[PDB]
Amino acid sequence: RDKAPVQPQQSPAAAPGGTDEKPSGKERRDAGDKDKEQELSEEDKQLQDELYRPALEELRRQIRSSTTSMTSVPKPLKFLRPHYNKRFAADIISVLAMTMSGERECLKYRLVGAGEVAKEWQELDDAEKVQREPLLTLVKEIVPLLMEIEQVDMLEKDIDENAYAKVCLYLTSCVNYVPEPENSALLRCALGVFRKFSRFPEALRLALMLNDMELVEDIFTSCKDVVMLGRHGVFLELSEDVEEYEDLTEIMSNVQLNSNFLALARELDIMEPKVPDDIYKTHLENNRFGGSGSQVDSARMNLASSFVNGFVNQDKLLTDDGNKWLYKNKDHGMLSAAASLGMILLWDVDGGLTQIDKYLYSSEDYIKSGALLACGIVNSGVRNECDPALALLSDYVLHNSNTMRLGSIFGLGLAYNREDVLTLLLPVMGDSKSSMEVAGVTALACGMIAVGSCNGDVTSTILQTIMEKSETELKDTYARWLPLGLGLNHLGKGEAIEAILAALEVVSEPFRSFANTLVDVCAYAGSGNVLKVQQLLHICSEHFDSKEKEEDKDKKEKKDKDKKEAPADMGAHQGVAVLGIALIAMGEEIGAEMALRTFGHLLRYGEPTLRRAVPLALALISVSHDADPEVSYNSIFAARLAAMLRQLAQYHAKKGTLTLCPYHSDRQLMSQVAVAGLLTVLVSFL
Amino acid sequence: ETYADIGGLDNQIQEIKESVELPLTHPEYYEEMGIKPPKGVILYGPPGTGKTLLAKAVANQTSATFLRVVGSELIQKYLGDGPKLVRELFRVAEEHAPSIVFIDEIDAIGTGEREIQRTMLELLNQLDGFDSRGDVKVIMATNRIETLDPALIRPGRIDRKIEFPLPDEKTKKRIFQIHTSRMTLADDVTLDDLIMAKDDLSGADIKAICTEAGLMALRERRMKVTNEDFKKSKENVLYKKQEG
């Protein structure tokens, strides 16, 4: 209708004209007006004017919110004391109260840091619980505990919509953009609403991110009350970290209520059903053992054959193909081949003793040391082979129990804050043998033992290895693999002060500064810390040619979830190892067409470091299109490292720390063949 | 638009499926025989237009490198360089061995002119495998099986040939069923007069009136297909190919 009779009604200041003109504006407010509310130029004089003043404030905030206003909108509502499923209610409530309380919660949440914003925010909470528009008013009310009482106040009937949708996209966006102190509220409030509701495995993911000991007991009495079993045992034992499986094995060593929580909590029930399931449903051909086991020569392709053999566990023909195969190999090949019988037998705990006992206490030191390493690899919960190896330990110069210390401390570290082995590891780190792998498997052993701690620790373990690290600035490989275990102990995020303490005491000559940037690598598991991205771009142009490799190599760990941003322009640079930084930054994912697109360019290189580094990620990222890149390797090559590693890819073709540590420690393969004894015992390969 | 979407010729599409999906795929029943006739099948169709033939060649698009040399259009629109373009496509097909060379709308002899015979004889010489082996398959498709000269038959077809039956409103029924499998429309739309509206048409201009039926039906801000707007948009296609 025309505004001729009703337009001059707002000009006089008569009280009856207001008390009847304003209800007319409430009646015609369902569609607003005939136009975009161009009456502000005529009704703007009523700002200084004030019986039914809440209706005048409602009209004022209605028109000021109608045309334009950024701060003056919610003031008439916070002073109005609002009083007195329809189209009108959806109009003035849904979008006008959504944006209204959105900018009120934004301006008040970002300005000061009262009850008005709580009453308005809960009023919008209930009004939008009636309107039932999901994830929109939620995604607007994310940044303004309030979210705790909001979720427990809303999560009554809708379970899979808010849980699946809100927890899915708000979990991905929460770990992507939302900072950590609010993600902890997502974990505790999600522990509440998910503890009171069904779908336990997502609360088990909340136990993976929380690393709490009560959640596994509540999910064991709640999963025990509501009874498949072997599956949640599989991803239960695989999902749990180093802390809650020993705390779990001690509280279940206490009561356990069924003997099935330690029956499952021990490394017997996640592995006893796999043997018949793997042997029955799968049937592997023998042409890989015959061919790939036939074109091996030069004592290095035979090492690749000990790799293919060791990482086979159906068929056990190449495992027992005669003798002298271990005798013809080299010393480090006697270590890897001696551990091969342990890598092929991560099953059948009863027969492991009568199968590995043949090489025990033999005439050769590497056979018995790799045999104790085999005993450490075959199992992880037996812990009955410690005494005959860890007992004596008295060498002090060179004796066999140092290599048996490699296999037994490394294998026991894979089997495992237990002091029953660290008190014996104190003279190990205090010995400082010239052999690098001693402090290698010792620092990595205590590191993998110390992952998952409560905000880490700055005790005399890392303090002792730092004082003894800086004691002698020789054989910088120690200054390279010691920061591995240091950064492993730096786990325990939640704004711990270990990075600041290391930034205060560790800052020295660029070796311990390389240790410091390694602490910066392991200290950024992931959060909203874009300062690490602008700092990454700022420090990316450093003259030091190793902190670019490790610090820039951290890209595959920091943004490992949002893989849409992982491909970058690192290939267009001119650094000597930046193509290796992106090549390793590819990783072990499903291997989309973009990844193989990067391997098409990274595959053709002249240096043996990139040509040797490309088949590992090329075959790990793809587990009639798998062997074709290997044929491309045959077209490129047809040295020894490229052939042994290309066969390693020939068999490799077909946030847990256990899957993040081995390759990050493997980033120092460009050294002597002594590391090749540790190259084949990587535990991250499933 | 996959190999299992269309009906009425499932045997004719599982013949080309089981025929050209034999090399480089499913090797347990491929290397024991040791035949390898690297010639590929040859398709044709009286309707043609690339819709049915593309619906037959779409079986290779499941898991393979995308590469289709559709017709000799680029041979005649360019200078008389001759077979060197086919040599470049054959060497990039050599560097792209896990592929299937598909040719649609062969208009070499159906449409300077003296060079078509020499580039077709040299095309036959390079297609037969003068200096090659069973690396990539070659599928030839056109609008008429009689357009291929007898020269291109004995050294151009040694693998298998097929026969395409007349549409008999069953290929049109299945194509229209696919075009109506995603859109929302009741049975109020007469099928026979629209699949046989001008003289006969399988999928091309019915896909066109489905595109301008979604767009033209979207002009009215309603997802429903009005009984007068669909034929009102059909009058443009019916009038276009008949006025000139």
PDB file of all heavy atoms in Angstrom, chain B residues 162-191:
ATOM      1  N   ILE B 162      31.582 -55.302 -35.122  1.00  0.00           N
ATOM      2  CA  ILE B 162      30.279 -55.385 -34.477  1.00  0.00           C
ATOM      3  C   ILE B 162      29.219 -54.828 -35.419  1.00  0.00           C
ATOM      4  O   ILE B 162      29.519 -54.249 -36.463  1.00  0.00           O
ATOM      5  CB  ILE B 162      30.249 -54.643 -33.122  1.00  0.00           C
ATOM      6  CG1 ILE B 162      30.759 -53.206 -33.275  1.00  0.00           C
ATOM      7  CG2 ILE B 162      31.068 -55.396 -32.085  1.00  0.00           C
ATOM      8  CD1 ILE B 162      29.663 -52.170 -33.451  1.00  0.00           C
ATOM      9  N   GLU B 163      27.959 -55.019 -35.029  1.00  0.00           N
ATOM     10  CA  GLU B 163      26.811 -54.525 -35.777  1.00  0.00           C
ATOM     11  C   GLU B 163      25.895 -53.771 -34.825  1.00  0.00           C
ATOM     12  O   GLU B 163      25.570 -54.274 -33.745  1.00  0.00           O
ATOM     13  CB  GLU B 163      26.054 -55.674 -36.453  1.00  0.00           C
ATOM     14  CG  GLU B 163      25.019 -55.231 -37.478  1.00  0.00           C
ATOM     15  CD  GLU B 163      23.661 -54.959 -36.860  1.00  0.00           C
ATOM     16  OE1 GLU B 163      23.340 -55.585 -35.828  1.00  0.00           O
ATOM     17  OE2 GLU B 163      22.914 -54.120 -37.408  1.00  0.00           O
ATOM     18  N   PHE B 164      25.481 -52.568 -35.227  1.00  0.00           N
ATOM     19  CA  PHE B 164      24.612 -51.745 -34.399  1.00  0.00           C
ATOM     20  C   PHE B 164      23.183 -51.847 -34.900  1.00  0.00           C
ATOM     21  O   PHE B 164      22.915 -51.482 -36.056  1.00  0.00           O
ATOM     22  CB  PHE B 164      25.075 -50.292 -34.414  1.00  0.00           C
ATOM     23  CG  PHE B 164      24.252 -49.384 -33.545  1.00  0.00           C
ATOM     24  CD1 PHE B 164      24.350 -49.450 -32.164  1.00  0.00           C
ATOM     25  CD2 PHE B 164      23.385 -48.463 -34.107  1.00  0.00           C
ATOM     26  CE1 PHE B 164      23.594 -48.616 -31.362  1.00  0.00           C
ATOM     27  CE2 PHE B 164      22.628 -47.625 -33.310  1.00  0.00           C
ATOM     28  CZ  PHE B 164      22.733 -47.702 -31.936  1.00  0.00           C
ATOM     29  N   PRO B 165      22.243 -52.325 -34.089  1.00  0.00           N
ATOM     30  CA  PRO B 165      20.854 -52.424 -34.546  1.00  0.00           C
ATOM     31  C   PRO B 165      20.171 -51.066 -34.567  1.00  0.00           C
ATOM     32  O   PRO B 165      20.655 -50.080 -34.006  1.00  0.00           O
ATOM     33  CB  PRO B 165      20.209 -53.353 -33.513  1.00  0.00           C
ATOM     34  CG  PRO B 165      21.009 -53.132 -32.274  1.00  0.00           C
ATOM     35  CD  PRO B 165      22.421 -52.860 -32.727  1.00  0.00           C
ATOM     36  N   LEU B 166      19.021 -51.028 -35.237  1.00  0.00           N
ATOM     37  CA  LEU B 166      18.247 -49.802 -35.322  1.00  0.00           C
ATOM     38  C   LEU B 166      17.702 -49.420 -33.943  1.00  0.00           C
ATOM     39  O   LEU B 166      17.460 -50.289 -33.100  1.00  0.00           O
ATOM     40  CB  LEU B 166      17.111 -49.962 -36.331  1.00  0.00           C
ATOM     41  CG  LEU B 166      16.239 -51.218 -36.258  1.00  0.00           C
ATOM     42  CD1 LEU B 166      14.959 -50.946 -35.494  1.00  0.00           C
ATOM     43  CD2 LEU B 166      15.932 -51.736 -37.656  1.00  0.00           C
ATOM     44  N   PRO B 167      17.513 -48.120 -33.688  1.00  0.00           N
ATOM     45  CA  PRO B 167      17.215 -47.676 -32.312  1.00  0.00           C
ATOM     46  C   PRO B 167      15.946 -48.265 -31.714  1.00  0.00           C
ATOM     47  O   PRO B 167      15.899 -48.471 -30.496  1.00  0.00           O
ATOM     48  CB  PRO B 167      17.113 -46.150 -32.457  1.00  0.00           C
ATOM     49  CG  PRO B 167      17.911 -45.831 -33.675  1.00  0.00           C
ATOM     50  CD  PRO B 167      17.693 -46.982 -34.606  1.00  0.00           C
ATOM     51  N   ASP B 168      14.909 -48.489 -32.530  1.00  0.00           N
ATOM     52  CA  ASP B 168      13.603 -49.036 -32.145  1.00  0.00           C
ATOM     53  C   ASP B 168      13.132 -48.595 -30.761  1.00  0.00           C
ATOM     54  O   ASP B 168      12.603 -49.402 -29.991  1.00  0.00           O
ATOM     55  CB  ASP B 168      13.595 -50.573 -32.274  1.00  0.00           C
ATOM     56  CG  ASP B 168      14.608 -51.280 -31.376  1.00  0.00           C
ATOM     57  OD1 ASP B 168      14.929 -50.797 -30.274  1.00  0.00           O
ATOM     58  OD2 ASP B 168      15.095 -52.353 -31.791  1.00  0.00           O
ATOM     59  N   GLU B 169      13.348 -47.315 -30.443  1.00  0.00           N
ATOM     60  CA  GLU B 169      12.863 -46.627 -29.247  1.00  0.00           C
ATOM     61  C   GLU B 169      13.276 -47.302 -27.940  1.00  0.00           C
ATOM     62  O   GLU B 169      12.822 -46.902 -26.862  1.00  0.00           O
ATOM     63  CB  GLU B 169      11.335 -46.460 -29.301  1.00  0.00           C
ATOM     64  CG  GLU B 169      10.506 -47.638 -28.800  1.00  0.00           C
ATOM     65  CD  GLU B 169       9.016 -47.404 -28.950  1.00  0.00           C
ATOM     66  OE1 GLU B 169       8.628 -46.334 -29.465  1.00  0.00           O
ATOM     67  OE2 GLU B 169       8.231 -48.291 -28.552  1.00  0.00           O
ATOM     68  N   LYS B 170      14.176 -48.282 -28.009  1.00  0.00           N
ATOM     69  CA  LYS B 170      14.717 -48.902 -26.806  1.00  0.00           C
ATOM     70  C   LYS B 170      16.026 -48.267 -26.365  1.00  0.00           C
ATOM     71  O   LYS B 170      16.224 -48.032 -25.168  1.00  0.00           O
ATOM     72  CB  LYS B 170      14.921 -50.406 -27.019  1.00  0.00           C
ATOM     73  CG  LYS B 170      13.628 -51.207 -27.051  1.00  0.00           C
ATOM     74  CD  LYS B 170      13.893 -52.702 -26.949  1.00  0.00           C
ATOM     75  CE  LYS B 170      14.405 -53.273 -28.259  1.00  0.00           C
ATOM     76  NZ  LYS B 170      13.347 -53.282 -29.308  1.00  0.00           N
ATOM     77  N   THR B 171      16.921 -47.968 -27.309  1.00  0.00           N
ATOM     78  CA  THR B 171      18.059 -47.116 -26.991  1.00  0.00           C
ATOM     79  C   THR B 171      17.589 -45.713 -26.630  1.00  0.00           C
ATOM     80  O   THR B 171      18.156 -45.068 -25.741  1.00  0.00           O
ATOM     81  CB  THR B 171      19.034 -47.076 -28.169  1.00  0.00           C
ATOM     82  OG1 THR B 171      19.428 -48.412 -28.510  1.00  0.00           O
ATOM     83  CG2 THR B 171      20.274 -46.267 -27.814  1.00  0.00           C
ATOM     84  N   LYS B 172      16.537 -45.234 -27.300  1.00  0.00           N
ATOM     85  CA  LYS B 172      15.944 -43.954 -26.936  1.00  0.00           C
ATOM     86  C   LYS B 172      15.216 -44.036 -25.602  1.00  0.00           C
ATOM     87  O   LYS B 172      15.204 -43.061 -24.841  1.00  0.00           O
ATOM     88  CB  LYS B 172      14.983 -43.490 -28.030  1.00  0.00           C
ATOM     89  CG  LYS B 172      15.627 -43.306 -29.392  1.00  0.00           C
ATOM     90  CD  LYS B 172      14.593 -42.909 -30.432  1.00  0.00           C
ATOM     91  CE  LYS B 172      15.208 -42.819 -31.818  1.00  0.00           C
ATOM     92  NZ  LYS B 172      14.189 -42.471 -32.845  1.00  0.00           N
ATOM     93  N   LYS B 173      14.605 -45.186 -25.301  1.00  0.00           N
ATOM     94  CA  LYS B 173      13.938 -45.349 -24.014  1.00  0.00           C
ATOM     95  C   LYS B 173      14.944 -45.367 -22.869  1.00  0.00           C
ATOM     96  O   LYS B 173      14.692 -44.791 -21.804  1.00  0.00           O
ATOM     97  CB  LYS B 173      13.098 -46.626 -24.015  1.00  0.00           C
ATOM     98  CG  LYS B 173      12.309 -46.852 -22.735  1.00  0.00           C
ATOM     99  CD  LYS B 173      11.347 -48.022 -22.878  1.00  0.00           C
ATOM    100  CE  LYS B 173      12.086 -49.349 -22.882  1.00  0.00           C
ATOM    101  NZ  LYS B 173      11.148 -50.505 -22.907  1.00  0.00           N
ATOM    102  N   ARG B 174      16.094 -46.014 -23.071  1.00  0.00           N
ATOM    103  CA  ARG B 174      17.101 -46.067 -22.016  1.00  0.00           C
ATOM    104  C   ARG B 174      17.851 -44.746 -21.888  1.00  0.00           C
ATOM    105  O   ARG B 174      18.177 -44.323 -20.773  1.00  0.00           O
ATOM    106  CB  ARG B 174      18.079 -47.213 -22.277  1.00  0.00           C
ATOM    107  CG  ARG B 174      17.443 -48.594 -22.236  1.00  0.00           C
ATOM    108  CD  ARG B 174      16.887 -48.905 -20.857  1.00  0.00           C
ATOM    109  NE  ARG B 174      17.933 -48.953 -19.840  1.00  0.00           N
ATOM    110  CZ  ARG B 174      17.707 -48.885 -18.533  1.00  0.00           C
ATOM    111  NH1 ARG B 174      16.468 -48.768 -18.077  1.00  0.00           N
ATOM    112  NH2 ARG B 174      18.721 -48.936 -17.678  1.00  0.00           N
ATOM    113  N   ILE B 175      18.130 -44.081 -23.011  1.00  0.00           N
ATOM    114  CA  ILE B 175      18.783 -42.776 -22.955  1.00  0.00           C
ATOM    115  C   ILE B 175      17.873 -41.753 -22.285  1.00  0.00           C
ATOM    116  O   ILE B 175      18.312 -40.984 -21.420  1.00  0.00           O
ATOM    117  CB  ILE B 175      19.207 -42.328 -24.365  1.00  0.00           C
ATOM    118  CG1 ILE B 175      20.448 -43.099 -24.821  1.00  0.00           C
ATOM    119  CG2 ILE B 175      19.463 -40.830 -24.401  1.00  0.00           C
ATOM    120  CD1 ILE B 175      20.793 -42.894 -26.280  1.00  0.00           C
ATOM    121  N   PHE B 176      16.593 -41.733 -22.665  1.00  0.00           N
ATOM    122  CA  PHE B 176      15.644 -40.847 -22.001  1.00  0.00           C
ATOM    123  C   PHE B 176      15.461 -41.226 -20.536  1.00  0.00           C
ATOM    124  O   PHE B 176      15.231 -40.350 -19.695  1.00  0.00           O
ATOM    125  CB  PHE B 176      14.302 -40.871 -22.731  1.00  0.00           C
ATOM    126  CG  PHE B 176      13.291 -39.906 -22.179  1.00  0.00           C
ATOM    127  CD1 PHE B 176      13.405 -38.548 -22.425  1.00  0.00           C
ATOM    128  CD2 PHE B 176      12.225 -40.356 -21.418  1.00  0.00           C
ATOM    129  CE1 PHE B 176      12.477 -37.656 -21.922  1.00  0.00           C
ATOM    130  CE2 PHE B 176      11.294 -39.469 -20.911  1.00  0.00           C
ATOM    131  CZ  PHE B 176      11.419 -38.118 -21.164  1.00  0.00           C
ATOM    132  N   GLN B 177      15.566 -42.518 -20.215  1.00  0.00           N
ATOM    133  CA  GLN B 177      15.498 -42.937 -18.819  1.00  0.00           C
ATOM    134  C   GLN B 177      16.696 -42.430 -18.025  1.00  0.00           C
ATOM    135  O   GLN B 177      16.558 -42.099 -16.842  1.00  0.00           O
ATOM    136  CB  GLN B 177      15.405 -44.461 -18.732  1.00  0.00           C
ATOM    137  CG  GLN B 177      15.182 -44.992 -17.326  1.00  0.00           C
ATOM    138  CD  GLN B 177      13.831 -44.597 -16.762  1.00  0.00           C
ATOM    139  OE1 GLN B 177      12.821 -44.620 -17.466  1.00  0.00           O
ATOM    140  NE2 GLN B 177      13.807 -44.230 -15.486  1.00  0.00           N
ATOM    141  N   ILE B 178      17.870 -42.357 -18.655  1.00  0.00           N
ATOM    142  CA  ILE B 178      19.039 -41.808 -17.976  1.00  0.00           C
ATOM    143  C   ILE B 178      18.900 -40.300 -17.815  1.00  0.00           C
ATOM    144  O   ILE B 178      19.220 -39.742 -16.758  1.00  0.00           O
ATOM    145  CB  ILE B 178      20.324 -42.182 -18.736  1.00  0.00           C
ATOM    146  CG1 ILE B 178      20.540 -43.695 -18.709  1.00  0.00           C
ATOM    147  CG2 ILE B 178      21.528 -41.464 -18.144  1.00  0.00           C
ATOM    148  CD1 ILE B 178      21.602 -44.172 -19.670  1.00  0.00           C
ATOM    149  N   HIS B 179      18.417 -39.615 -18.855  1.00  0.00           N
ATOM    150  CA  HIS B 179      18.215 -38.174 -18.765  1.00  0.00           C
ATOM    151  C   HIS B 179      17.112 -37.801 -17.783  1.00  0.00           C
ATOM    152  O   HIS B 179      17.094 -36.667 -17.294  1.00  0.00           O
ATOM    153  CB  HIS B 179      17.903 -37.595 -20.146  1.00  0.00           C
ATOM    154  CG  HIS B 179      19.100 -37.490 -21.040  1.00  0.00           C
ATOM    155  ND1 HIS B 179      19.518 -38.524 -21.849  1.00  0.00           N
ATOM    156  CD2 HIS B 179      19.969 -36.473 -21.249  1.00  0.00           C
ATOM    157  CE1 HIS B 179      20.593 -38.148 -22.518  1.00  0.00           C
ATOM    158  NE2 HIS B 179      20.887 -36.908 -22.173  1.00  0.00           N
ATOM    159  N   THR B 180      16.197 -38.722 -17.485  1.00  0.00           N
ATOM    160  CA  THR B 180      15.167 -38.498 -16.481  1.00  0.00           C
ATOM    161  C   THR B 180      15.483 -39.165 -15.150  1.00  0.00           C
ATOM    162  O   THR B 180      14.676 -39.078 -14.220  1.00  0.00           O
ATOM    163  CB  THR B 180      13.809 -38.988 -16.992  1.00  0.00           C
ATOM    164  OG1 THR B 180      13.901 -40.371 -17.356  1.00  0.00           O
ATOM    165  CG2 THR B 180      13.369 -38.175 -18.199  1.00  0.00           C
ATOM    166  N   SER B 181      16.635 -39.830 -15.036  1.00  0.00           N
ATOM    167  CA  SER B 181      17.028 -40.451 -13.778  1.00  0.00           C
ATOM    168  C   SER B 181      17.517 -39.438 -12.753  1.00  0.00           C
ATOM    169  O   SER B 181      17.483 -39.727 -11.552  1.00  0.00           O
ATOM    170  CB  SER B 181      18.116 -41.499 -14.025  1.00  0.00           C
ATOM    171  OG  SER B 181      17.627 -42.565 -14.821  1.00  0.00           O
ATOM    172  N   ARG B 182      17.969 -38.266 -13.195  1.00  0.00           N
ATOM    173  CA  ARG B 182      18.445 -37.217 -12.303  1.00  0.00           C
ATOM    174  C   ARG B 182      17.446 -36.079 -12.141  1.00  0.00           C
ATOM    175  O   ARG B 182      17.327 -35.518 -11.048  1.00  0.00           O
ATOM    176  CB  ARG B 182      19.777 -36.654 -12.811  1.00  0.00           C
ATOM    177  CG  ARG B 182      20.925 -37.649 -12.774  1.00  0.00           C
ATOM    178  CD  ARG B 182      22.218 -37.020 -13.265  1.00  0.00           C
ATOM    179  NE  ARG B 182      23.307 -37.989 -13.340  1.00  0.00           N
ATOM    180  CZ  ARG B 182      24.131 -38.266 -12.335  1.00  0.00           C
ATOM    181  NH1 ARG B 182      23.993 -37.646 -11.171  1.00  0.00           N
ATOM    182  NH2 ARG B 182      25.094 -39.164 -12.493  1.00  0.00           N
ATOM    183  N   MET B 183      16.726 -35.727 -13.202  1.00  0.00           N
ATOM    184  CA  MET B 183      15.737 -34.666 -13.133  1.00  0.00           C
ATOM    185  C   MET B 183      14.434 -35.186 -12.529  1.00  0.00           C
ATOM    186  O   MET B 183      14.200 -36.392 -12.422  1.00  0.00           O
ATOM    187  CB  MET B 183      15.486 -34.076 -14.519  1.00  0.00           C
ATOM    188  CG  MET B 183      16.678 -33.338 -15.106  1.00  0.00           C
ATOM    189  SD  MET B 183      16.372 -32.743 -16.781  1.00  0.00           S
ATOM    190  CE  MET B 183      15.188 -31.437 -16.465  1.00  0.00           C
ATOM    191  N   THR B 184      13.576 -34.250 -12.128  1.00  0.00           N
ATOM    192  CA  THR B 184      12.286 -34.558 -11.519  1.00  0.00           C
ATOM    193  C   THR B 184      11.186 -34.191 -12.508  1.00  0.00           C
ATOM    194  O   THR B 184      10.971 -33.008 -12.794  1.00  0.00           O
ATOM    195  CB  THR B 184      12.111 -33.809 -10.200  1.00  0.00           C
ATOM    196  OG1 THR B 184      12.151 -32.397 -10.441  1.00  0.00           O
ATOM    197  CG2 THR B 184      13.216 -34.184  -9.225  1.00  0.00           C
ATOM    198  N   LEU B 185      10.493 -35.204 -13.026  1.00  0.00           N
ATOM    199  CA  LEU B 185       9.413 -34.986 -13.979  1.00  0.00           C
ATOM    200  C   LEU B 185       8.513 -36.212 -13.991  1.00  0.00           C
ATOM    201  O   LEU B 185       9.006 -37.345 -13.987  1.00  0.00           O
ATOM    202  CB  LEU B 185       9.965 -34.694 -15.383  1.00  0.00           C
ATOM    203  CG  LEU B 185      10.923 -35.701 -16.029  1.00  0.00           C
ATOM    204  CD1 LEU B 185      10.180 -36.677 -16.932  1.00  0.00           C
ATOM    205  CD2 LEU B 185      12.016 -34.977 -16.801  1.00  0.00           C
ATOM    206  N   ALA B 186       7.203 -35.983 -13.992  1.00  0.00           N
ATOM    207  CA  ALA B 186       6.235 -37.067 -13.990  1.00  0.00           C
ATOM    208  C   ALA B 186       6.094 -37.660 -15.391  1.00  0.00           C
ATOM    209  O   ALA B 186       6.781 -37.267 -16.339  1.00  0.00           O
ATOM    210  CB  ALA B 186       4.889 -36.576 -13.461  1.00  0.00           C
ATOM    211  N   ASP B 187       5.184 -38.625 -15.523  1.00  0.00           N
ATOM    212  CA  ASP B 187       4.931 -39.298 -16.792  1.00  0.00           C
ATOM    213  C   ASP B 187       4.023 -38.499 -17.721  1.00  0.00           C
ATOM    214  O   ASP B 187       3.618 -39.021 -18.766  1.00  0.00           O
ATOM    215  CB  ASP B 187       4.323 -40.680 -16.538  1.00  0.00           C
ATOM    216  CG  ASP B 187       5.297 -41.630 -15.870  1.00  0.00           C
ATOM    217  OD1 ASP B 187       6.519 -41.479 -16.082  1.00  0.00           O
ATOM    218  OD2 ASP B 187       4.842 -42.529 -15.132  1.00  0.00           O
ATOM    219  N   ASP B 188       3.692 -37.255 -17.367  1.00  0.00           N
ATOM    220  CA  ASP B 188       2.824 -36.437 -18.208  1.00  0.00           C
ATOM    221  C   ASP B 188       3.475 -36.060 -19.533  1.00  0.00           C
ATOM    222  O   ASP B 188       2.785 -35.565 -20.430  1.00  0.00           O
ATOM    223  CB  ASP B 188       2.403 -35.175 -17.451  1.00  0.00           C
ATOM    224  CG  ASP B 188       3.588 -34.382 -16.932  1.00  0.00           C
ATOM    225  OD1 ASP B 188       4.735 -34.857 -17.070  1.00  0.00           O
ATOM    226  OD2 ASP B 188       3.371 -33.280 -16.386  1.00  0.00           O
ATOM    227  N   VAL B 189       4.778 -36.279 -19.676  1.00  0.00           N
ATOM    228  CA  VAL B 189       5.510 -35.901 -20.881  1.00  0.00           C
ATOM    229  C   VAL B 189       5.492 -37.086 -21.841  1.00  0.00           C
ATOM    230  O   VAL B 189       6.067 -38.138 -21.553  1.00  0.00           O
ATOM    231  CB  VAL B 189       6.944 -35.471 -20.554  1.00  0.00           C
ATOM    232  CG1 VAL B 189       7.714 -35.178 -21.831  1.00  0.00           C
ATOM    233  CG2 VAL B 189       6.936 -34.257 -19.637  1.00  0.00           C
ATOM    234  N   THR B 190       4.821 -36.916 -22.978  1.00  0.00           N
ATOM    235  CA  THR B 190       4.742 -37.977 -23.976  1.00  0.00           C
ATOM    236  C   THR B 190       6.124 -38.294 -24.535  1.00  0.00           C
ATOM    237  O   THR B 190       6.860 -37.398 -24.955  1.00  0.00           O
ATOM    238  CB  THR B 190       3.796 -37.569 -25.105  1.00  0.00           C
ATOM    239  OG1 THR B 190       4.245 -36.340 -25.687  1.00  0.00           O
ATOM    240  CG2 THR B 190       2.382 -37.384 -24.573  1.00  0.00           C
ATOM    241  N   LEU B 191       6.472 -39.583 -24.540  1.00  0.00           N
ATOM    242  CA  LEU B 191       7.807 -40.000 -24.958  1.00  0.00           C
ATOM    243  C   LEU B 191       7.906 -40.186 -26.469  1.00  0.00           C
ATOM    244  O   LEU B 191       8.901 -39.780 -27.079  1.00  0.00           O
ATOM    245  CB  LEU B 191       8.199 -41.298 -24.247  1.00  0.00           C
ATOM    246  CG  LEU B 191       8.726 -41.213 -22.811  1.00  0.00           C
ATOM    247  CD1 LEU B 191       7.595 -41.002 -21.816  1.00  0.00           C
ATOM    248  CD2 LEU B 191       9.518 -42.464 -22.465  1.00  0.00           C
TER     249      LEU B 191
END
